Amino acid sequence: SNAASSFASVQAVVNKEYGLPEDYKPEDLVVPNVPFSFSGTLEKSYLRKEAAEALERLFDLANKEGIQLNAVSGFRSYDYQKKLYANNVKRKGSAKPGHSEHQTGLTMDVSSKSANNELELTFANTKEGKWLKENAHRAGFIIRYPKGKESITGYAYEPWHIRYVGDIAESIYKKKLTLEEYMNL
Ligand SMILES: [Cl-]
Ligand SMILES: [Cl-]
Ligand SMILES: [Cl-]
Ligand SMILES: [Cl-]
């Protein structure tokens, strides 16, 4: 009971405990037509079609209120996550392969120029970070790892990390719940 159930669902919970199939790669990956903090088309330029279109919509919403967001890193394959994890562990003198939500193709790191497009806490103090915190849900996204929820999500606050879950994001935001709690996983 270490394997994520309904692994391909928009509401799947992938975390320290629940892992995805090592051979799971979404079959509907596309590049969302949004600005990116990096050039070219790499594996991280993709999101599942539905999450891609939602992200485009979130960015249009942001632009209407003068908020300019940049996409930093989306989909990451099992293969990639393995190397990243191994090379990150030996740097002692990051999620385990399969246990990163990025492999679902529903997750995206976002930042802004006001934060040097970096994925750091300071992004929370920017007008863009704050807008994202309170507006992510309007497009189907949630801040996957909120402030004092590390006990439940297993990760410290990540203001830059959004997860597409669809219509339930509205309720998750209002009720101040984590995806774990909302899905009883
Ligand atoms: Cl691909
Ligand atoms: Cl949220
Ligand atoms: Cl919190
Ligand atoms: Cl925290």
Residue numbers in the entry: -2 to 0, 55 to 144, 152 to 243
Could you share sentences copied from the article?
We report biochemical properties and crystal structures of the LD-carboxypeptidases LdcB from Streptococcus pneumoniae, Bacillus anthracis, and Bacillus subtilis. The enzymes are active against bacterial cell wall tetrapeptides and adopt a zinc-carboxypeptidase fold characteristic of the LAS superfamily. LD-carboxypeptidases subsequently hydrolyze the L-Lys[A2pm]—D-Ala bond to release the tripeptide. The LdcB enzymes are single domain proteins comprising two subdomains separated by a V-shaped cleft.
A further BaLdcB structure has been solved that contains no bound zinc ion, but there are negligible differences between it and its counterpart with zinc bound. The active site of the LdcB enzymes is, therefore, sculpted in a robust fashion, competent for peptidolysis once the catalytic machinery is completed by the incorporation of zinc. Though the BaLdcB structure contains the same subdomain, it is less well structured in this region than BsLdcB and SpLdcB, and, as a consequence, the β1–β3 sheet is not formed.
